[PDB]
Design a protein around this ligand. Sequence first.
Ligand SMILES: CCCCCCCC/C=C\CCCCCCCC(=O)O[C@@H](COC(=O)CCCCCCCCCCCCCCC)COP(=O)([O-])OCC[N+](C)(C)C
Ligand SMILES: *[C@@H]1O[C@H](CO)[C@@H](O[C@@H]2O[C@H](CO)[C@@H](O)[C@H](O[C@H]3O[C@H](CO)[C@@H](O)[C@H](O)[C@@H]3O)[C@H]2NC(C)=O)[C@H](O)[C@H]1NC(C)=O
Ligand SMILES: *[C@@H]1O[C@H](CO)[C@@H](O[C@@H]2O[C@H](CO)[C@@H](O[C@H]3O[C@H](CO)[C@@H](O)[C@H](O)[C@@H]3O)[C@H](O)[C@H]2NC(C)=O)[C@H](O)[C@H]1NC(C)=O
Ligand SMILES: *[C@@H]1O[C@H](CO)[C@@H](O[C@H]2O[C@H](CO)[C@@H](O)[C@H](O)[C@H]2NC(C)=O)[C@H](O)[C@H]1NC(C)=O
Ligand SMILES: CC(C)CCC[C@@H](C)[C@H]1CC[C@H]2[C@@H]3CC=C4C[C@@H](O)CC[C@]4(C)[C@H]3CC[C@]12C
Ligand SMILES: *[C@@H]1O[C@H](CO)[C@@H](O)[C@H](O)[C@H]1NC(C)=O
Ligand SMILES: *[C@@H]1O[C@H](CO)[C@@H](O)[C@H](O)[C@H]1NC(C)=O
Ligand SMILES: *[C@@H]1O[C@H](CO)[C@@H](O)[C@H](O)[C@H]1NC(C)=O
Ligand SMILES: *[C@@H]1O[C@H](CO)[C@@H](O)[C@H](O)[C@H]1NC(C)=O
Ligand SMILES: *[C@@H]1O[C@H](CO)[C@@H](O)[C@H](O)[C@H]1NC(C)=O
Ligand SMILES: *[C@@H]1O[C@H](CO)[C@@H](O)[C@H](O)[C@H]1NC(C)=O
Ligand SMILES: *[C@@H]1O[C@H](CO)[C@@H](O)[C@H](O)[C@H]1NC(C)=O
Ligand SMILES: *[C@@H]1O[C@H](CO)[C@@H](O)[C@H](O)[C@H]1NC(C)=O
Ligand SMILES: *[C@@H]1O[C@H](CO)[C@@H](O)[C@H](O)[C@H]1NC(C)=O
Length: 1194
Amino acid sequence: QSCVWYGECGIAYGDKRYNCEYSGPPKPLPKDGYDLVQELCPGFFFGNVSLCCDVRQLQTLKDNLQLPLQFLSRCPSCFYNLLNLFCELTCSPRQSQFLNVTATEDYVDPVTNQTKTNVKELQYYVGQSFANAMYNACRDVEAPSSNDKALGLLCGKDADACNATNWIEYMFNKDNGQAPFTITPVFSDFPVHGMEPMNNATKGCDESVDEVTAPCSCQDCSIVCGPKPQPPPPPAPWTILGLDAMYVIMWITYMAFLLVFFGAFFAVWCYRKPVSAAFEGCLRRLFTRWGSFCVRNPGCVIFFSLVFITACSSGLVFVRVTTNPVDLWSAPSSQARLEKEYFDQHFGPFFRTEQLIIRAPLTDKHIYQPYPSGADVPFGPPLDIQILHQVLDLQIAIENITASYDNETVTLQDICLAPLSPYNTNCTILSVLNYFQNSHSVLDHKKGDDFFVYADYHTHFLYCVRAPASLNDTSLLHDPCLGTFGGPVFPWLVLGGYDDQNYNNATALVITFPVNNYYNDTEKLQRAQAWEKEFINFVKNYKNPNLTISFTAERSIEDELNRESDSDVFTVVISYAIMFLYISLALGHMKSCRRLLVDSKVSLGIAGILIVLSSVACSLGVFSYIGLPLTLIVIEVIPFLVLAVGVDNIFILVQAYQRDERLQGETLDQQLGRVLGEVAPSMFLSSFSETVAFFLGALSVMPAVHTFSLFAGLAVFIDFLLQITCFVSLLGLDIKRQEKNRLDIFCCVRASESCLFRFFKNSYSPLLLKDWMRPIVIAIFVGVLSFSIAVLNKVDIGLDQSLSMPDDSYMVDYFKSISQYLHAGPPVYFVLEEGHDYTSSKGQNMVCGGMGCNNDSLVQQIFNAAQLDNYTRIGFAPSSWIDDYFDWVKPQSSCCRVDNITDQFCNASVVDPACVRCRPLTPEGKQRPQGGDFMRFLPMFLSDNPNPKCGKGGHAAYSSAVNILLGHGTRVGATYFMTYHTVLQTSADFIDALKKARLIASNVTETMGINGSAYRVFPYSVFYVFYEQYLTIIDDTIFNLGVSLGAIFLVTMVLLGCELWSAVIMCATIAMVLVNMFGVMWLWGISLNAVSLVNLVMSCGISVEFCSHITRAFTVSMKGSRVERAEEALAHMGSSVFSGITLTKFGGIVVLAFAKSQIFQIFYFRMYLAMVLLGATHGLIFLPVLLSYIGPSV
Ligand SMILES: CCCCCCCC/C=C\CCCCCCCC(=O)O[C@@H](COC(=O)CCCCCCCCCCCCCCC)COP(=O)([O-])OCC[N+](C)(C)C
Ligand SMILES: *[C@@H]1O[C@H](CO)[C@@H](O[C@@H]2O[C@H](CO)[C@@H](O)[C@H](O[C@H]3O[C@H](CO)[C@@H](O)[C@H](O)[C@@H]3O)[C@H]2NC(C)=O)[C@H](O)[C@H]1NC(C)=O
Ligand SMILES: *[C@@H]1O[C@H](CO)[C@@H](O[C@@H]2O[C@H](CO)[C@@H](O[C@H]3O[C@H](CO)[C@@H](O)[C@H](O)[C@@H]3O)[C@H](O)[C@H]2NC(C)=O)[C@H](O)[C@H]1NC(C)=O
Ligand SMILES: *[C@@H]1O[C@H](CO)[C@@H](O[C@H]2O[C@H](CO)[C@@H](O)[C@H](O)[C@H]2NC(C)=O)[C@H](O)[C@H]1NC(C)=O
Ligand SMILES: CC(C)CCC[C@@H](C)[C@H]1CC[C@H]2[C@@H]3CC=C4C[C@@H](O)CC[C@]4(C)[C@H]3CC[C@]12C
Ligand SMILES: *[C@@H]1O[C@H](CO)[C@@H](O)[C@H](O)[C@H]1NC(C)=O
Ligand SMILES: *[C@@H]1O[C@H](CO)[C@@H](O)[C@H](O)[C@H]1NC(C)=O
Ligand SMILES: *[C@@H]1O[C@H](CO)[C@@H](O)[C@H](O)[C@H]1NC(C)=O
Ligand SMILES: *[C@@H]1O[C@H](CO)[C@@H](O)[C@H](O)[C@H]1NC(C)=O
Ligand SMILES: *[C@@H]1O[C@H](CO)[C@@H](O)[C@H](O)[C@H]1NC(C)=O
Ligand SMILES: *[C@@H]1O[C@H](CO)[C@@H](O)[C@H](O)[C@H]1NC(C)=O
Ligand SMILES: *[C@@H]1O[C@H](CO)[C@@H](O)[C@H](O)[C@H]1NC(C)=O
Ligand SMILES: *[C@@H]1O[C@H](CO)[C@@H](O)[C@H](O)[C@H]1NC(C)=O
Ligand SMILES: *[C@@H]1O[C@H](CO)[C@@H](O)[C@H](O)[C@H]1NC(C)=O
């Protein structure tokens, strides 16, 4: 071997210097540029260099490799081969084997008068199997700020006809302007002239160069990237013979019923062609005696009852109302609640977001034409320069807002969050103007001379949507796009309306203002909300006819719902007023026109209404004393229920008395005691059946059903007691009044067979019970039940979240804008709990997405999930911190650097006095820092800032994502890897996201193989606490309804004697009522949530109020046949049940039909109408017939 040239003494032009000829042996390197030899091509570094090379040559080589390094360094396997073509060309130790100089001439030294030999020209023999493997591995490298091929900018011509041989000729040719002298390559695989070219090892875009440099991406290599992933979409519909397969199982279940049912009548119709009485008797006697007592001791009874009422209802002073949505919709110990408790403790609560979807409707899209060459690039309307200036003006004004609070000003700079503070304090604003750093200057500056612009803001936008974490454009612009706060701005968070990569086509601009959310602190939260109110007002009063903004504040949903939840109290008040008017006017039988205001029960009806309201208030007050807080579901469903039950009892009693004829020689208190002893068992059965049902239903973990059950049970019981005592005393007093000829309400001025009882008895009961009508009724009701069972499993789950808002609100527009434009959703945090090692090869492989770490690790699994992005609603990559930590610590990167004597972190921008690299640049140092080096360099990484020479640093993104536990070796605590969800528009979307995130977390926890369950991965998102209730709502409904109905069943079959048949008939009728309630749900579009569940558990209590009465009046009867017993029970009890509860609630609902609120008109008006009329029909038209048919004899 031998050399051809050494040193650089000649000069071509500018600074280009021709290498100086020397054909001696290879020089031992001067020990000066060892760093360079390990940076250019370490293939020569095995010390005893004896390199033909020169330190003045190595450092002049690197200067020419500057631009080729920037483009081709994207793909390590490419730039690797490119270097092997240069070192050997310049200073390899066997240079003479593959080189032959051609043109040289003497050079004069201005230093010694010594003529030096320059190297003017020469030819370079390169193998063909080398140039093909080189060009073929780089042809796929894409350029920055474009989708072209990187060779198009390095060939000297189009990248469409770049042969592998012409590209090498252009690089060595001085015609480009870089080569100080041109080298003529000679391509040949076989030795010619006794001279055989060089062919060193080569690597493709798929093979990795080192056990630490990951292979090339399929963006930059066509062979690495294969078949896309795909999930199997299961619909899981049965569709027996073409239709839903449930529509059919029933219609076949029904046709069978009419034939097996109508096939027995027409079959027979052609054929004809001791302990119970002991418990049912002591109750009558007890109630008779106590009724007489209460009728002859009104003063004592009423006084003690009023004292009790006051003692119980004075607890309303301690009344608390629950409005915080977390406490409302989240169980205090649910999985999501514990996860939120864990995340808020180790990482601080999730922040508050104020977004802004700006759009330019007037402007049109325009075309961008690159100067040198390239296809046209169209830009959306909002990406116009004028619209960008106006949006920058709007944002700078949004920063003004001060929003004084508590006699102090509250600026955004004060409330927002700055990741890397107090070094940099601006704060996180996520807009597309951060690419230009919120500067009109940086946005409006172009580089070029007339007739064309070299660069423009289009070029910067295109470059930075591709690489949003750069610190300089480094190509004809030299501007960073990191953002004033420090840290990348991802194009999918700041744009909307494009198509899958083309942020050029964006039609909307998103602008987020992250604000701190505080964990157990109220002064700061008040400050944030006080600033948000002024932000909302400002954005609402901004005209800018060029823009259409759809905004939101963190405090906006709560305000919109508190604004819609009123202006209908004027309707509820009229509803209750009409209910009370009817109750007051209907208790009294007329019997005469000239005797009206004397036989009137207005005062007694007022007393009954007051007793009912008193029962409500005593329940609320007792539970206020105990400490249970109220709720807006309770405050609305308790009055309805308690009024229904109380009015039913009042009418039952008053009418059972009015239709009674007094025996002779029998006094008033004895007559009333007899009437009450014969009427009280039914009211007691109903009251006990409902109380036990509700109290027993207060076992669920749903905060909406638990509190409601408690409140309603106590109210029903207290109302029963207050009635049985106070109302009987007042009934005795009013009977005295009416017998002493005293006039009605004003004062002291001196049998009935009600018109309804004469209708149910004379025209309705006989007709309904004829032999040609009972089968019709049963057929119709079984058909409706069959329909309900068929369309049952098609009921929705969840609440829309757009119907809780008024229709004239801006949140409706914001939701439309989200669904129509946004491409990202709420962020997800896959929190890896405390207990992982992180300081071992395997402990790191389980978490990596990288070179050597496993293929099923946490980061790789989240990456796959994001590759699905439709099955798994995870849209983007995990963005792990440990990969960035390793990239930072790698010696090549050379961001880490410690002080030599102090072992202190020398920044990457430092005078370089005595600071050495953290990891030695050797084969052992390349590896990951697995031992104590990991934990010795991690804190310095997390404290590093975004240095222009280093890169992004690990402070603005991971200081909060990594928890370090000082003391005891200072291990790592809990950490998270945060990604983003896909746009979630409906409750189905949110529940689907919750399910599949949980699935991914469980998969990762499985693969990690933890000893026991010491720790685990879990995802945290903001809406998880609000949507975790819909993951068990079906079984919650099942449990609640079944338990409530079984309690009703047992209580009935116990109190009513022991008749299981009567109890089972009643239970079956109430189950029918519930199934038909679900059918009406499906048919009118009511959804299954914590409001519908409360209304169903409530209806379970009015079904009883109808059935129990009708069925008990039938059971305890001594008529002859079932038909006559049924019609007698119907007349007697159903005349009071139809007039008391049915007509009252019907007037109420008909007044309530004018609600003006969607949540109300959907979940209360419709549910109440359905419940009331369904229960009325079922009881009064199906208990009669079913009992007539299969009732218990006696
Ligand atoms: C001891 C035994 C206990 C356990 C077993 C008990 C089982 C038997 C007991 C009761 C019946 C059980 C029915 C299960 C529901 C269907 C299951 C299913 O396929 O999921 C469906 C749930 O469908 C819904 O979303 C609404 C379902 C609510 C059912 C509640 C019935 C309770 C009342 C009954 C009466 C009183 C009950 C209490 C009396 C005891 C899937 O629905 P989806 O896909 O979300 O819908 C959207 C579809 N869409 C887009 C096309 C519109
Ligand atoms: C979304 O953005 C893409 C760009 O990534 C748009 O694609 C471009 O479409 C415009 C339409 O005017 C074309 O100007 C451009 O095509 C240019 O190059 C071809 C050469 O093949 C030339 O024949 C055309 O005259 C033009 O100069 C497209 N560029 C590319 C590379 O696709 C696309 O239109 C946008 N989508 C929508 C829905 O607007
Ligand atoms: C990812 O998301 C969807 C899979 O669940 C699916 O969305 C696509 O885009 C829109 C969504 O509204 C729809 O496409 C429309 O236009 C096509 C013509 O190509 C019609 O055939 C459709 O009926 C529809 O009107 C589809 O819902 C769907 N099709 C596309 C892409 O247009 C995507 O296909 C999914 N893709 C992947 C790879 O995840
Ligand atoms: C955000 O903080 C940055 C520093 O991180 C500030 O930087 C700018 O300061 C001036 C504007 O007030 C500009 O004239 C400077 O050119 C710019 N800094 C540099 C690097 O030159 C900036 O003030 C803060 N906010 C804004 C609105 O930019
Ligand atoms: C714009 C593009 C073409 C530039 C990329 C090609 C450049 C980097 C290539 C082509 C020719 C090469 C040069 C050829 C000759 C020498 C002299 C030697 O003693 C040091 C290396 C040096 C200085 C090379 C540096 C890299 C080089 C300049
Ligand atoms: C270069 O790559 C192409 C792939 O398109 C292949 O067809 C060709 O055989 C390769 N030539 C080589 C490796 O010499
Ligand atoms: C509002 O912001 C502007 C921006 O330059 C600033 O000049 C002004 O002092 C701020 N306060 C105002 C206008 O009250
Ligand atoms: C604000 O505080 C100062 C100092 O306590 C006080 O003098 C001033 O009156 C306060 N402002 C108002 C409006 O009360
Ligand atoms: C970005 O611009 C050039 C291009 O690479 C680079 O040399 C420079 O160091 C960078 N900017 C700064 C401020 O260092
Ligand atoms: C709106 O656009 C017009 C036309 O570009 C411009 O003159 C005006 O300043 C913009 N802003 C307004 C009208 O507030
Ligand atoms: C993932 O795990 C290991 C990789 O080392 C291997 O056994 C397994 O086949 C890999 N899976 C796939 C699909 O390649
Ligand atoms: C770099 O480190 C030095 C250490 O003295 C510090 O002064 C400087 O602010 C740092 N620069 C950054 C973090 O950008
Ligand atoms: C750094 O410290 C080591 C150990 O004392 C020493 O050998 C080395 O020469 C020092 N380097 C510099 C640049 O001072
Ligand atoms: C968990 O892994 C199984 C098989 O390894 C896979 O079928 C399932 O889809 C994974 N869960 C996800 C991707 O959520």
